[PDB]
Symmetry: C2
Subunit: 412 residues, 2 copies
């Protein structure tokens, strides 16, 4: 009869895609297409498990040597070494000189929150909750959240998407980077910009690099699709491996969710670059204490699989093949969509579709055009014109292209 | 050459046991004993993997039906149902009336931090960072930490350990519970008090129950050793299952680390009891949003094993057997130590050793006596006189008892 502490609780509300796919689920129309699904799908609209992953799982399932005792707080030793080595390169002299520790975390999200909560207490003084934060416009929906609920109360949007011409707005944001309270932190996308797909060219990275070396900035990379983006580890980590040979430091947040398909195993690593082996051991020290209060220590299964893969030469081999599979499919569905849009003389340029890298891509549509695709043609995608390219198959591709043609033409 | 943001970083320092076992590791003395190891060890001083766990792992390893796609933010559906059902009972009408959701978290630690960070924003008003916090004296070392770094700046110690007579100080803390700013939250140990082992009797629980129902308290249980403590699920969850039939509500933090041996898989559940199906769906709603910023969603492997076990009758059967194994060993090492202490006419009463429940136990020694065991007899344990009973085997038991005899007698 009396009150509920539980009553007077604000419902929280259905986020962007969660409601989107739900509507798709109940849609009885047989030509419906879901392009807002948040992982990689095959051409038959199915989840794919990497054979190299199914392979290692069997090896683990049979190793009666393994136990289930607590791991080091920072995580499985081998994993952190392999992961950072993957992002920075084996032949990186920044490894020989002992510059970096890894922290095994809970996916890419966990790498941020730990690297985030760390900065709001040891970066820019002590317990500095006022330091500005670099987020792109637009950005992965909870770059904001992970830094907000980490402390920081201003969040700063450097323009990134250029609506007209559908490409990169370089000095549109390179200029904004100048205005900022300098010496602030910058969470850059390593490659495959979520949710646009447009990455800076190596030349343009040099620009953003020096111009913000010159003048007070700390990078906080988000390497979530390394290898998964373009089908290769060497060029996807270039913007990372350049910052090291110049002589920077940064936190790099690695996610193995998309490029190992290990979404529900939450495999991730925070790579931390230094000066000299001095304070890295110091960073890693009270990185532990941050973790201890979040999760006592990280889970083992997902990490072992990645570690067993990256350490072994004939699994690494098979893995990069599997990664190239997921890759090549996306790049093909790009070249195909562009071609079909161009084959129908669809008003506008559509280079961006093939210039963008990765699984997500900005079409260049505005919610009035998108509204048409969702309600009349039952193509489900976000109002920001964002599609999951892996949502495009060989059967729906011709319908979707023609639908996009109808949208741009009929609705301005 | 220039500064390091990384320099001027405070090293954090080696905690209690981490330094303790390290010293044990380098100790060349052949009669050394480690009683500060933080998990269950066999009589041969080894980690034990439950056969029922090795069993389910094989079943999972062979189910080619499973994928690695993201789980619900709150976690694997089956797990949360089985876990809460385990703590509250299948025949609990508080389940039929839809009172409770579970939130799959990262071990027991994760269940707290989520349940903690939730209260510091929806409990006792809104964004109430001032509400007092109940922690025992002493308590599991990071009941304090998990609530501190969750916000709260006062932490209140209700006396729990009674140095002389080595047992429970009931109204010593039942009185302190009266003084507190009422309507504050209370993280009670369900059973197996870490690090003492003394649990209140069912009668004494009724006392603490009503007297703090009567007057403004919200329980926040820590069920970390359910079944693992006394070798059974029915009496270990009694203090929980009583609070529900009275008509309370609370968060219960379940850990499956010790009772499934799944430490490095980080399996845990936050059970949340309500009034009426109303605001539980509301609690679970913005429980998701708290999780999203911590870890996007929880890992699957550890949860599936527990879920597959608790849902299946002939695995549940085998599991409770394995749990009874770990249990009975501890209870035996208790009755044996007590007997050997009593057989040597060791000055003092030693009932507490056999009255305490669970893996951890307070001997009743004070660091001057403990100092003797560690430096002269190379028995490693915490200054609080805390031992890991599973550290006691059939070979060291006679040495340790005799050592404890020497400590109490020679050093007052």
């Amino acid at each position: 009869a009396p009150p509920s502490v539980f009553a007077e609780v604000p419902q929280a509300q259905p986020v962007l895609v969660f409601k989107l796919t739900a509507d798709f689920r109940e849609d009885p129309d047989p030509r419906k297409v879901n392009l807002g699904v948040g992982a990689y799908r095959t051409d038959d609209c199915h989840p794919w498990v990497l054979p190299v992953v199914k392979k290692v799982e069997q090896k683990i399932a049979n190793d009666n040597s393994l136990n289930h005792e607590y791991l080091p707080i920072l995580g499985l030793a081998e994993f952190r070494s392999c992961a950072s080595r993957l992002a920075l390169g084996d032949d990186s002299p920044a490894l020989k000189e002992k510059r970096v520790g890894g922290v095994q975390s809970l996916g890419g999200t966990g790498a941020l929150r730990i690297g985030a909560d760390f900065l709001a207490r040891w970066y820019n003084g002590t317990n500095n909750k006022n330091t500005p934060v670099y987020v792109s416009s637009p950005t992965w929906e909870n770059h904001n959240a992970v830094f907000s609920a980490a402390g920081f109360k201003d969040i700063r949007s450097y323009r990134y998407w250029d609506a007209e011409k559908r490409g990169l707005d370089l000095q549109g944001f390179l200029n904004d980077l100048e205005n900022a309270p300098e010496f602030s932190i910058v969470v850059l996308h390593a490659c495959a910009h979520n949710p646009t797909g447009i990455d800076p060219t190596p030349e343009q990275w040099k620009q953003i690099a020096s111009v913000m070396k010159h003048r007070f900035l700390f990078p906080f990379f988000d390497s979530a699709y390394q290898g998964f983006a373009s089908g290769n580890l060497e060029r996807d980590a270039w913007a990372i491996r350049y910052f090291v040979s110049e002589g920077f430091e940064f936190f790099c947040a690695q996610s193995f969710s998309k490029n190992f398909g290990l979404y529900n195993e939450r495999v991730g690593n925070l790579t931390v670059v230094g000066k000299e082996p001095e304070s890295i051991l110091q960073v890693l020290s009270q990185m532990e204490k941050i973790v201890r209060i979040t999760w006592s220590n990280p889970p083992a299964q997902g990490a072992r699989i990645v570690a067993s893969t990256l350490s072994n030469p004939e699994l690494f081999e098979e893995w990069t093949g599997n990664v190239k599979t997921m890759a090549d499919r996306i790049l093909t569905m790009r070249s195909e969509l562009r071609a079909r849009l161009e084959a129908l003389k669809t008003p506008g340029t559509w280079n961006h579709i093939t210039d963008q890298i990765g699984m997500f891509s900005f079409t260049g549509l505005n919610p009035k055009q998108v509204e048409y695709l969702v309600n009349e043609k039952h193509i489900y995608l976000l109002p920001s014109g964002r599609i999951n390219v892996s949502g495009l198959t060989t059967k729906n591709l011709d319908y979707v292209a023609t639908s996009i043609h109808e949208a741009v033409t009929k609705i301005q």
